[PDB]
Amino acid sequence: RKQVSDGVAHIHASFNNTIVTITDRQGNALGWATAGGSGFRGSRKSTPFAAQVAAERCADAVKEYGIKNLEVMVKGPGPGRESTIRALNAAGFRITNITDVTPIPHNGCRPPKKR
């Protein structure tokens, strides 16, 4: 519909999934593609190649507006989830900055018990 060319991307890299969304400087999301929606199940939805193809299928699906520059932040201790941003940048999008914004509390609440 329009042209932005200055956006910001958010990747929720869960320990067993991967979500990616892009918005434009204000919070209004445009497109999203889950790595769990392209035939991937089991542990395949947790591999770096899954992140690669998710980055590809989210980059091609947002070309209706033609974004070039991008802001990007890392969230969640997703194993091997820098391949997705490397691929997004390799797809012709000049990334500006990277930063890990995983939420850290101040001993606010009690985390669930582990095995």
Partner RNA sequence: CUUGAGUCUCGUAGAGGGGGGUAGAAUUCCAGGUGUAGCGGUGAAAUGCGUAGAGAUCUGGAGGAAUACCGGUGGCGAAGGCGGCCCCCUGGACGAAGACUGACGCUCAGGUGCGAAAGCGUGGGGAGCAAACAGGAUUAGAUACCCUGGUAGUCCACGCCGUAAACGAUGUCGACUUGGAGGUUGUGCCCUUGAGGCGUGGCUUCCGGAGCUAACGCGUUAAGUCGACCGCCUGGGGAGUACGGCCGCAAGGUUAAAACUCAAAUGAAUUGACGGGGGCCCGCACAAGCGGUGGAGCAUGUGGUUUAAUUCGAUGCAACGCGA
Instruction: State the residues that interact with RNA by CB under 7 A.
Output: 10, 12, 14-17, 19, 21, 23, 26-32, 34-37, 41-43, 45-46, 75, 103-113, 115
Nearer to RNA, 19 or 70 (CB): 19
Q: Closest separation between CB of residue 63 and RNA, Å?
A: 14
Cβ proximity to RNA, 75 vs 86, nearer residue: 75
Q: How far is the CB of 110 from RNA (least distance, A)?
A: 4
Q: What burial letters (b/e) apply to 83-103, b meaning 16+ CB within 10 Å?
A: bbbebbbeeebeeeeeeeeee
CA pair distance 48, 83, nearest whole angstrom: 6
Question: Which of 23/83 has CB closer to RNA?
Answer: 23
| Smallest distance from RNA to CB 45, Å | 7
List all residues 6 or more positions away from 61 whose beta carbon is below 8 Å from its beta carbon. 31, 33
User: Distance (Å, rounded) from C-alpha 10 to C-alpha 22?
Assistant: 6
Residue whose CB is less far from RNA, 22 or 87: 22
Asked whether the beta carbons of 4 and 70 are under 8 A apart, the reply is no
